[PDB]
Design an enzyme around this catalytic site. Structure first.
Site, mmCIF file in Angstrom:
data_model
loop_
_atom_site.group_PDB
_atom_site.id
_atom_site.type_symbol
_atom_site.label_atom_id
_atom_site.label_comp_id
_atom_site.label_asym_id
_atom_site.label_seq_id
_atom_site.Cartn_x
_atom_site.Cartn_y
_atom_site.Cartn_z
ATOM 1 C CG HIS B 41 58.876 45.390 -11.853
ATOM 2 N ND1 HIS B 41 59.084 45.633 -13.217
ATOM 3 C CD2 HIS B 41 58.181 44.858 -11.160
ATOM 4 C CE1 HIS B 41 58.455 44.418 -13.152
ATOM 5 N NE2 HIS B 41 57.414 43.940 -12.570
ATOM 6 N N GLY B 143 57.942 40.863 -20.274
ATOM 7 C CA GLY B 143 56.905 42.061 -20.896
ATOM 8 C C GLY B 143 55.680 41.955 -20.643
ATOM 9 C CB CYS B 145 54.973 42.897 -15.828
ATOM 10 S SG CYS B 145 55.910 41.779 -14.476
#
Ligand SMILES: *[C@H](O)[C@H](C[C@@H]1CCNC1=O)NC(=O)[C@@H]1C[C@H](C)CN1C(=O)[C@@H](NC(=O)OC(C)(C)C)C(C)C
Ligand SMILES: *[C@H](O)[C@H](C[C@@H]1CCNC1=O)NC(=O)[C@@H]1C[C@H](C)CN1C(=O)[C@@H](NC(=O)OC(C)(C)C)C(C)C
Ligand SMILES: [Cl-]
Ligand SMILES: [Cl-]
Ligand code: NA
Ligand code: NA
Ligand code: NA
EC number: 3.4.19.12
Lengths: 301, 306
Positions: B41, B143, B145
């Site tokens: 993503h 932030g 991920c």
């Protein structure tokens, strides 16, 4: 969102851990630059751990009486000295993995990460707090001595604890990295006991603010309290007094949530009076006291 | 003695964490040999997330659209490909700090350590369990991920989790390192929710053994039960079924303490039916289920990693 007992990443400390053997005793050392730090009780024998005279015992040691191993490499000891309850072994090789570091002596209520080690190798990492009675509630087995506690705010490792002993209640005692014990304890087998412990009130308040940040409201109430009435109540539950310093340090969290510090104190008073009535706060059915205000801001923001 | 929620030492993983930027999105990647792994993503705009067509968005991207940074060193991306919900960026440099590792998919009830990272920089480490509903109760901000979960066996890192998203109740969802989600979740901006969760019975039993090892015994009693009878109680309290394999796995702890599993089950039955009467177990007023039997044995015996 979420809120966990979070330790600092341990890699900078892992690269400093070594094995130290003297006689039949093995424990861990901390290898920084060309010095290995470890508990001085590594030089005690089984015939005199009650009243060891460490100055007399150390003068009788040769450098080759100390076996220091960094992974698969023996480090050669070239000198030794004692600073309070820590032994400093000078070795012929500087640690190339030495991080930026400092030594800091902490106050009760402060938290730190522990890298538990055996035979110079790391087993695991967890969070601790220096208790008001100067013990820590660790997880330590035989051979764990010389494991350290540390913080890494920013990029510098602040070493604050070195492990030395287990007291009869199952809690732990040790020193700063200058070798000074936290609390009244001594590295002798003479009778010693931790004082009655108390709850770290400022940290409980910090954690209630973390719960509000994470969406909890059920324990809030319409009441406030004076600082002195709060302390009169809190001490009846073996909570530490809340000082004006503590009120001040909770200011930022109070601003962020819109809940005045003494308003949150009234919430804590009610929780002590009533319990949680089957509810939980941040996954606990007890009031948690091993997160500082600084910890809460770091993890939530 | 003592018993703490303990994470694996994170050093071997810290050396693999990098920063990945695509467009205005920054998150973390896992740099192993000459490949950086990160959530797919990262390639989406807020638009695309509504109903993303990932393979179409990716062919549109070039290698230069991905900025990868190891500390302050830029790594040149020289190829890219998708594997399920993970993006694989081939870089021109093998990570000299690559540990011995493999990719594993864990089962619900198993625990692992999370290295929470921001901007490619490790920030904290904590221990989690894969819940029966396939979420984890993490602690993750914007932030985070690309942060990963792992276990260590001797000197081998087993990567099992990469972080992708936060669900409405504040729990977390992600994938294995082959990009397969844990649970019925998708990396799409559509309504999704954690399902009702259950308690990991075998882990509660392991933690009761840990308590006994550490001197906490008030909940022990003279009674035993049957696997059949106990599982009827477990069902009633939204506890997972206890299987014969669970019983066998606990055998070492039963031998060590003298409390057979079904003897301990009779303790757990009474705790569920009667509560703790104001007492605590290992400093908790709840029944803890994020320690496995192996976690208890490892911690109580001092296992280390090489
Ligand atoms: C060092 O590795 C070791 C770590 C201990 C062992 C069990 N859990 C731990 O945290 N520390 C010691 O063995 C030190 C050395 C000291 C001479 C005795 N000691 C202890 O921890 C002992 N405590 C002790 O004697 O307590 C008093 C009697 C002083 C209160 C325990 C081994 C009993
Ligand atoms: C990646 O760093 C980020 C991690 C999040 C941010 C807040 N806490 C975390 O764990 N992940 C995301 O921002 C992903 C990307 C996706 C486009 C949205 N998203 C979310 O986690 C969001 N969840 C969400 O949209 O949930 C559904 C509505 C799809 C169920 C949250 C930011 C709300
Ligand atoms: Cl019976
Ligand atoms: Cl609890
Ligand atoms: Na000092
Ligand atoms: Na109030
Ligand atoms: Na029983």
């Amino acid at each position: 969102s979420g809120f966990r007992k979070m330790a600092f990443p341990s890699g900078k400390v892992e690269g400093c851990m070594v094995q130290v053997t003297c006689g039949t005793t093995t424990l861990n050392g901390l290898w920084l630059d060309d010095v290995v730090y470890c508990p001085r009780h590594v030089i005690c024998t089984s015939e005199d751990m009650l009243n060891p005279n460490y100055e007399d015992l150390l003068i009788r040691k040769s450098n080759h009486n100390f076996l220091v191993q960094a992974g698969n490499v023996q480090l050669r000891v070239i000198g030794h000295s004692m600073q309070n309850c820590v032994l400093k072994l000078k070795v012929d090789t500087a640690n190339p993995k030495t991080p930026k570091y400092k030594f800091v002596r902490i106050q009760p209520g402060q938290t730190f990460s522990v890298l538990a080690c055996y035979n110079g190798s790391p087993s695991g990492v967890y969070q601790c707090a220096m208790r008001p009675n100067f013990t820590i509630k660790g997880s330590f087995l035989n051979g764990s001595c010389g494991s350290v506690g540390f913080n890494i705010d920013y990029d510098c490792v602040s070493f604050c604890y070195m492990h030395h002993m287990e007291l009869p209640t199952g809690v732990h005692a040790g020193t700063d990295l200058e070798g000074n014990f936290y609390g009244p304890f001594v590295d002798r087998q003479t009778a010693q006991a931790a004082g009655t412990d108390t709850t770290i009130t400022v940290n409980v308040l910090a954690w209630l603010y973390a719960a509000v940040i994470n969406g909890d409201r059920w324990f809030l109430n319409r009441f406030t309290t004076t600082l002195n009435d709060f302390n009169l109540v809190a001490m009846k539950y073996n909570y530490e007094p809340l000082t004006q310093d503590h009120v001040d340090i909770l200011g930022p969290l109070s601003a962020q949530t819109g809940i005045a510090v003494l308003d949150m104190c009234a919430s804590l008073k009610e929780l002590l009076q009533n319990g949680m009535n089957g509810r939980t706060i941040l996954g606990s059915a007890l009031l948690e006291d091993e997160f500082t205000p600084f910890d809460v801001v770091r993890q939530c923001s």
